[PDB]
Design a binder for this molecule. Structure first.
Ligand SMILES: CCCn1nnnc1NC(=O)c1ccco1
Ligand SMILES: [Cl-]
Ligand SMILES: [Cl-]
Length: 182
């Protein structure tokens, strides 16, 4: 009803269509990517500096760190939106690694439509300090995108890319894409 064919457009990149959205996966350092939004996977205090979160806050810089702690003390947040700092993006959306991954990705997609953004880059949310299982994380990320497309909500969003720190986790995402393909 939605899934296209899995192929490799560039060395180390694997893609398929989900409705009108191009979904891609690759291994690498997410802080070297350019996109309208980059997603951080962090703690419920939005101040963690371990794994992906360490790289994102160090690269983004101290003003982004300060924006995070200011919003954390203002109210109870499921996620927060900051500037991009010295990352190559318009905004960072910081999600909680321990939360339901399908819910977190659905929120990211909705916030990107609100800003008329076209591109998103995310890590394998939850697979760091939160120690969620990679197979369940891949299923949840792709399920969120399918639901967004099924509801007719994809208008501005055209490209969603997962950049994954460990090659072994990339293999789990690729297998899930092959399970779903048309
Ligand atoms: C310099 C050695 C790399 N390294 N070693 N242990 N953890 C990391 N890094 C990350 O988890 C990470 C995510 C994105 C960029 O870095
Ligand atoms: Cl995590
Ligand atoms: Cl990752």
């Amino acid at each position: 009803m939605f899934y296209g064919t899995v192929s490799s457009p560039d060395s180390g990149v694997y893609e398929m269509k989900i409705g009108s959205i191009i979904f891609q996966v690759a291994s690498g350092d997410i802080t070297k990517e350019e996109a309208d939004v980059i997603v951080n996977s962090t703690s419920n205090s939005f101040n963690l500096k371990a794994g992906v979160s360490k790289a994102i806050l160090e690269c983004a810089g101290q003003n982004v760190e300060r924006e995070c702690s200011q919003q954390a003390q203002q109210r109870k947040n499921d996620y927060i939106i900051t500037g991009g700092g010295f990352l190559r993006c318009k905004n960072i959306i910081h999600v909680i690694g321990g939360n339901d991954v399908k819910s977190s990705v659905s929120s990211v997609l909705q916030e990107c439509e609100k800003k008329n953004y076209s591109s998103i880059c995310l890590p394998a949310i939850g697979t760091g300090n939160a120690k969620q299982h990679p197979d369940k994380v891949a299923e949840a990320i792709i399920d969120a995108i399918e639901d967004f497309v099924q509801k007719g909500s994809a208008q501005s969003v055209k490209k969603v890319k997962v950049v994954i720190f460990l090659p072994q986790v990339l293999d789990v995402f690729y297998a899930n894409m092959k399970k779903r393909e048309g």
